[PDB]
């Protein structure tokens, strides 16, 4: 079996712009378990980006978290690369969400 991951980027607390926050890229329901998660800031890879199970439906979940502070110009997204997708899926953070 080969399941497509389910990315979603959001913050730990409501963003107050130019105010420190903690990004959470929550990848879910995917298979197999191998999977590399890119934490970007304007394409830029973020060095430290903390990591690390599967739900009752066998789907492998993982959550990635790296501190950050919202701009009204700079940007962030999560870059996931899995054997379920030909090339990588990137999901820009939608503060607006």
């Amino acid at each position: 079996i080969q399941k497509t991951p389910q990315i979603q980027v959001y913050s730990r607390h409501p963003p107050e712009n130019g105010k420190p926050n903690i990004l959470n890229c929550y990848v879910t329901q995917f298979h197999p378990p191998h999977i590399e998660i890119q934490m970007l800031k304007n394409g830029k890879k973020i060095p430290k980006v903390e990591m690390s199970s599967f739900s009752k439906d066998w789907s492998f979940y993982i959550l990635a978290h790296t501190e950050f502070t919202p701009t009204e110009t700079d940007t962030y997204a999560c870059r996931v690369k899995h054997d379920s997708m030909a090339e990588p899926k990137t999901v820009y953070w939608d503060r607006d969400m």
């Binding site: 079996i1 329901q29 739900s55 009752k56 439906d57």
Partner: protein, 118 residues
Amino acid sequence: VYWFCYSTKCYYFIMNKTTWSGCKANCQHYSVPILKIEDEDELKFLQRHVIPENYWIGLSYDKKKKEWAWIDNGPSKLDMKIRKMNFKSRGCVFLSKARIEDIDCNIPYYCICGKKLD
């Protein structure tokens, strides 16, 4: 994406992952409601026929009517109400080649529409 059936009942199987209401919709949209495991052996046939994956079958928790309810709101013979079902998680049920478990109704899985034939 196709249809097959057993004895006094004909089935349709959606191979497009969606939320639970996901089937309900398409299911009734092809006028064949989301499944209802009516009795023992029927389940047995399913699990076996069923290609490997998680399927949704009409079997959710009617939040205010505080009770697990079949889609036709009529009991089955399958009183595997014994899978006690409910723990710090509420929701909907899905079938595996060897399972019948409940979970978050917004999880996208495959579909199992089950109309009767008599």
